[PDB]
Amino acid sequence: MKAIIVKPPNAGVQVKDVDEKKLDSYGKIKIRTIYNGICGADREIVNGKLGKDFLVLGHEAIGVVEESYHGFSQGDLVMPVNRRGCGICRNCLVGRPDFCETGEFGEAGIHKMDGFMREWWYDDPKYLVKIPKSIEDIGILAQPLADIEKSIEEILEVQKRVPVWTCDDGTLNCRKVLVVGTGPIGVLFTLLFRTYGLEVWMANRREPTEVEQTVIEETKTNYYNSSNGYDKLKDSVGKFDVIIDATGADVNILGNVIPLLGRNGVLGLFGFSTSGSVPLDYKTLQEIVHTNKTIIGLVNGQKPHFQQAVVHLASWKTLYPKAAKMLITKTVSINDEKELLKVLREKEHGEIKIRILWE
Amino acid sequence: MKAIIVKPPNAGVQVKDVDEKKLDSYGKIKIRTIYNGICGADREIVNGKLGKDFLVLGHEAIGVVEESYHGFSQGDLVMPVNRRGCGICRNCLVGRPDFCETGEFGEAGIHKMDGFMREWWYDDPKYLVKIPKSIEDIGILAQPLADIEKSIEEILEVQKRVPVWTCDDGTLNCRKVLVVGTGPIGVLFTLLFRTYGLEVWMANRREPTEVEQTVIEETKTNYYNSSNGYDKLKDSVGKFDVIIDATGADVNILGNVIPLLGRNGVLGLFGFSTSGSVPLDYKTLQEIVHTNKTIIGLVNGQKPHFQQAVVHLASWKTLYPKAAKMLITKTVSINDEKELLKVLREKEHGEIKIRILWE
Amino acid sequence: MKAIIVKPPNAGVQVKDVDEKKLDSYGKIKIRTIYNGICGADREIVNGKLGKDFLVLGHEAIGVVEESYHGFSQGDLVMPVNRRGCGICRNCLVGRPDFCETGEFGEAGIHKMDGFMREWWYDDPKYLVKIPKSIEDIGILAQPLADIEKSIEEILEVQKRVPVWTCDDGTLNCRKVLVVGTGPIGVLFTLLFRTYGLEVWMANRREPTEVEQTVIEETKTNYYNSSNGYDKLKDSVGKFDVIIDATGADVNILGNVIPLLGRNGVLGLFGFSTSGSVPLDYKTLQEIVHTNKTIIGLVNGQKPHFQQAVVHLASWKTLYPKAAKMLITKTVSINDEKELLKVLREKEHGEIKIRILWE
Amino acid sequence: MKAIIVKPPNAGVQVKDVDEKKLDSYGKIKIRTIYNGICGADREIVNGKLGKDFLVLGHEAIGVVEESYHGFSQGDLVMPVNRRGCGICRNCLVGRPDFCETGEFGEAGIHKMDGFMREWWYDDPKYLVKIPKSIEDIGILAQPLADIEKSIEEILEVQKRVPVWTCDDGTLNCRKVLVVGTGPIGVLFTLLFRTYGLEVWMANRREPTEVEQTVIEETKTNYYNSSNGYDKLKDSVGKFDVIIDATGADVNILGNVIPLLGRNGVLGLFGFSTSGSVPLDYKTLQEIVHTNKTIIGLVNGQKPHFQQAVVHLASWKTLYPKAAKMLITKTVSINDEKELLKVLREKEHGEIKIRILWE
């Protein structure tokens, strides 16, 4: 069977024929892959930065149900949930390995579990999210968007601690969010926060790309060029109710944006920084105490968040049609080995999402 | 009228007769002071570390109602809430200036507002907490305990984000708390967490004092001497679900204890750190993201928290009688000027709470 | 100015020119009406079943902003929130008159407040919901859908009382809802519950209409003909986690469906029952106690719910395109007086929403 | 082994020696019974109103730990949790069989499980609540109080649906509770709500008893003689935010109190009504809809609620010492057969709690 395979911790990737019989099966439902998505985590494993001699790559997939089984009919499009539980802890037992207490969960295409960059796989209906045919084209985004749905859900849950965090009109329209770093993560955070009605500023150390300018315009989002720091933003707009670190950057980014967090505010750490050490002095931390600020680590969406993501992607075809049409940057055929290896190995500037087509 | 006065931002304190006419009045109920408490906040203003020429010091008070007004009867004991609202924001409008959005709140005996170290004052029934005569002796602690009630309440609210944070038996008995630092704040966090049933480890850079040893034994709390760091605690007990910084010390303490935070855990910042800069490297921050960890600034209790504190102090006379009887370190007469000025200016080693008695 | 007017409690309705100076203004923004919606509440006032000589009818409107104000561009479509606060109670003061504690709120086109069946009106920006031009056709439904958004939000909030109400897969997909009474309210409850992923059964004392059959098939909803009661449904499907009374029917409907409520379940009372008395015996009530059942009165959506409604309407254009195009039964011109009076006075069988167009 | 045994559904009760091998064991810890409590449920079984030849009666117990086990020391006092889970559903698996989804749970001394009126039993440490020696005398009340702790917890959780249910001072002190029925349950509800600071009116169809009068005066609670209905209370006091049925009597009591429920209010059904049928008319039900009222079935406390009960009983020894000393009406020796059978068979007027002492 054709599969894209990796050999962690070693760098490298192959697109080749493997023995179908030694690949991981998860249930009774046979699913033929139509699309995969690629993201930074795939790039990391391919570049070695994270009885089986290999692992099937890929955790973003849309496939078609080959034969009707229970609630699933032949021809239905489905997406697998990628993180699966440890089987021992109470969070996993209620279907929420995002909060696994043991750390012994599996992650398709990354850890302990064969991924979905293969011709077909067998899965359990419990781990399958129904993808409407009407969002077949952008539906691949439901996996990355699920992470962001969970993250925003969590931020809103935490802010229930504030006696009144709503605005004079009962909404959250008055609350301002700073999304630091663009790319697929920043863009999806922005789209979702605008959908919820919060004001958004996107920030990056440069002017907007064509895609970001469309998002700015269509979603009525603000943009800040942070090339020379954040003083001018603070001077003009003031402080923010929520700040999202969506950069995989140097942790000194946090030193730049922490002074822009307002009273009762939340700093959501979503990106995985891979450089730097950030100094926090007593003045900064004392201020955090006095003003009820919170810093939260945000990771991993689960089935309910994939479903929310499907509804939002559907909404964006109507609300933000121009931005929705830019979520998918390009599609590469599984049969195009040279182009496939290139995109698996490295991101292109201004890439949102690369899709792999099985044919 | 006899009053203890300060002149911020200037260092210094005086006990003298002042014109009752230039003192702040807050409502129609006349209250004669019986006790005040002293804390580090009083020491700070006295030492200049933070029409009207002066401010009446003091935010911890128990007074007696001199004349029956509405629901308050003559002879009733009351304690005033010390932080009061800005009158503009929605949090203050619902009685919760602990989450004030303007920062224009008042704090009795500290900022904008005359305190309670005076023979008598007038107050509004809405800011008065009823103090049962059966806890007259230890009731002064309800004010500092209120801050801690709010803090624990907030930690538990935030942890509702975790799908299941309860244990196999439906309680929080399996959850472990590290309380860093053991003066009145760390001791009160320990007593309250044990009342809630969580396991507690107190930590200081030394062996316990007598009072602490009484807490250890009576409340079945654990103690760790952190003089040579925390590796041995980590190796023996593992990681903690909650960590409270109850030290007003160098922020590098957080560097020490962050590695001891467990999956889904909460670092509660309560102490007001006065020195240092702590480096947080990418590995630490990445881990925080991967494990859904949270850091929260904890400050200020309000009326419902004062009321909860009364119930808990009452409970401790039965549950923890030895500990409860050590909460009050000493009592100084308002008339004993040399001693009073001494205790206002500086803490004694091992002090928990000093009371000022009006007679 | 042309307006549709009533004189409660008397029966009758007129479409005529009225003096602008007599009509209620609510703010600085001029809005030219383009669409109104008609519902049962309108028919009730028209038929006399519910300093001003008259009241402007109507509480469902979409208008166009006439000038470029702060936040609102000229040509923007907006919808007014219909219930407005009493200005005294804490619920109203946080933008939530749905929970008004005084009952002294106003309801546009019903009580205290001129409605929106007029050429134009002046409003405060705080009461305006933005209606994307991409949902101009079905956007009028955002008002009725808002009541339903609030209702489901409240049901889900209440069900947080159950330690685990989610399913084996972390979703609510395993939860079953019985929606009693089809057409508009029942149809919208069904669409929204299926959007959230819950299983739905619609019930009416007849077979489905053409429109209901579309919704049934496209949303994968079940239908039960309740003409001879509920024994057959109970025997086949069992009991339900949520039951919604979406009928304005005799209260004895509740006696029929209460035996179908499952453990930990919620009976949502949304319809305004019009006759009857229902007996509850001790056996029924003790069983409610034993099984943690809840009965909840559900009324009125506010601004955040209108905004959620807009997102869901947009989603349905892609998720349920056939059903979405059957939401608007027909549009009547404001200038077609004979047909207008007819649709104001009586519902037609199987009607979902009639829209009035201003030209 | 001596044990008190019954044979449901037959009436009758025996205190005799029974074969130890025939009695249910629940774990490895041996617990020697020191006290049991008797309540209405016991009286019902004794009077036959609700593989084994018999069932050991009793679900209210304090026993002594025979050997120093895991976290339990020889001589420690413990109380068993009486309802135990089905082992299948997600609520039972998180330690919360109060919300069991299968109904397959066991109830010590009532259903599927031998009770605790026996010389000793073996238990699992997970089902054991530590009873401080400082509350040995009234600690037996922790089991009935647990049900009430759960109930008030649930009411407060449900009321988070109201945007602001707190008062001008951030507390619930402005909220009024009507407790209908003044037995062990009504008294316990009253004490706990007053502990939480809510205003309470107790109601019964007579003047108070001495015990009740003592509760009334010491807790600053109000009393209403409801012998001639509730019109006079409604006229004098108005309506209530919470109404608790602590009856057991005829369900028509609900018809009488429902008109006294206020906006956004909660009717808590705790008592097990024993007769009658109450009519609810369309006017009553539509007003429930209009005012966001809720009716909730309240049943069963679990381990966290036992632990909260321990803290509150301890608090009452200081807060309400006179009331606390009236909670135990009398103690009967296990060897006093004539008196024992008397108290098992029938309640005495004004009784709160009868305790059985194993001598």
Ligand SMILES: NC(=O)c1ccc[n+]([C@@H]2O[C@H](COP(=O)([O-])OP(=O)(O)OC[C@H]3O[C@@H](n4cnc5c(N)ncnc54)[C@H](OP(=O)(O)O)[C@@H]3O)[C@@H](O)[C@H]2O)c1
């Ligand atoms: N927590 C979770 O569950 C989770 C899930 C998925 C992904 N992630 C992490 O999320 C992070 C972002 O993902 P992604 O796929 O969007 O990454 P990406 O494609 O690498 O995009 C990173 C964005 O950050 C911008 N950036 C870099 N330095 C910046 C700075 N100093 N200030 C502002 N912006 C800066 C980059 O600018 P340029 O456009 O000019 O290059 C780019 O737009 C990564 O660390 C990824 O690992 C976390």
Ligand SMILES: NC(=O)c1ccc[n+]([C@@H]2O[C@H](COP(=O)([O-])OP(=O)(O)OC[C@H]3O[C@@H](n4cnc5c(N)ncnc54)[C@H](OP(=O)(O)O)[C@@H]3O)[C@@H](O)[C@H]2O)c1
């Ligand atoms: N956020 C709020 O609402 C709020 C309210 C009240 C107070 N506070 C702040 O809370 C903090 C504690 O108050 P407090 O009155 O208890 O202070 P305190 O009396 O100064 O006690 C501080 C404790 O920390 C110990 N300590 C110092 N350095 C330490 C270290 N490196 N590791 C472990 N322990 C260390 C001290 O040890 P020794 O016993 O050996 O001296 C002492 O036991 C202060 O910063 C205070 O300003 C905050």
Ligand SMILES: NC(=O)c1ccc[n+]([C@@H]2O[C@H](COP(=O)([O-])OP(=O)(O)OC[C@H]3O[C@@H](n4cnc5c(N)ncnc54)[C@H](OP(=O)(O)O)[C@@H]3O)[C@@H](O)[C@H]2O)c1
């Ligand atoms: N709580 C709130 O905030 C709120 C807001 C808006 C509306 N409402 C109320 O919600 C209720 C429904 O609104 P609507 O506009 O959908 O009303 P509607 O157009 O009158 O629809 C009523 C539906 O119930 C069906 N029905 C009647 N008796 C039935 C029975 N015994 N069993 C099952 N179905 C039965 C009707 O059947 P047919 O199709 O065969 O006639 C119709 O499908 C009304 O009482 C309305 O006033 C409440």
Ligand SMILES: NC(=O)c1ccc[n+]([C@@H]2O[C@H](COP(=O)([O-])OP(=O)(O)OC[C@H]3O[C@@H](n4cnc5c(N)ncnc54)[C@H](OP(=O)(O)O)[C@@H]3O)[C@@H](O)[C@H]2O)c1
């Ligand atoms: N839901 C649960 O988890 C749970 C748990 C435990 C108990 N319960 C139930 O709670 C109920 C109360 O328990 P209990 O032990 O307190 O019962 P109890 O000892 O029988 O007390 C009943 C009280 O109600 C009074 N009463 C009777 N009719 C009344 C009326 N029409 N209006 C006002 N008061 C009236 C009685 O008056 P007199 O004093 O004049 O006789 C007595 O004070 C019982 O039904 C019991 O089964 C439920």
Ligand SMILES: O[C@@H]1[C@@H](O)[C@@H](O)OC[C@H]1O
């Ligand atoms: O923010 C939007 C709001 O302005 C309105 O249009 O409702 C939907 C939201 O997405």
Ligand SMILES: O[C@@H]1[C@@H](O)[C@@H](O)OC[C@H]1O
């Ligand atoms: O019920 C739906 C679910 O099956 C999936 O498609 O996600 C969106 C939900 O509306």
Ligand SMILES: O[C@@H]1[C@@H](O)[C@@H](O)OC[C@H]1O
């Ligand atoms: O109530 C607090 C008081 O205890 C002290 O810490 O000073 C700050 C106040 O918020």
Ligand SMILES: O[C@@H]1[C@@H](O)[C@@H](O)OC[C@H]1O
């Ligand atoms: O918003 C509601 C409206 O839709 C209708 O039901 O009339 C009453 C209002 O509360």
Ligand SMILES: O[C@@H]1[C@@H](O)[C@@H](O)OC[C@H]1O
């Ligand atoms: O209601 C009480 C309140 O008045 C205060 O005294 O604090 C404790 C509460 O129990």
Ligand SMILES: O[C@@H]1[C@@H](O)[C@@H](O)OC[C@H]1O
């Ligand atoms: O931790 C305690 C628990 O073990 C039990 O005794 O109930 C009260 C709690 O304070």
Ligand SMILES: O[C@@H]1[C@@H](O)[C@H](O)OC[C@H]1O
């Ligand atoms: O689901 C997450 C995935 O989207 C990200 O790419 O890697 C971490 C996972 O938890």
Ligand SMILES: O[C@@H]1[C@@H](O)[C@H](O)OC[C@H]1O
């Ligand atoms: O715990 C409850 C008990 O107190 C009552 O007596 O019987 C039913 C149980 O659920």
Ligand SMILES: [Zn+2]
């Ligand atoms: Zn990915």
Ligand SMILES: [Zn+2]
């Ligand atoms: Zn796990």
Ligand SMILES: [Zn+2]
């Ligand atoms: Zn203080």
Ligand SMILES: [Zn+2]
């Ligand atoms: Zn304020």
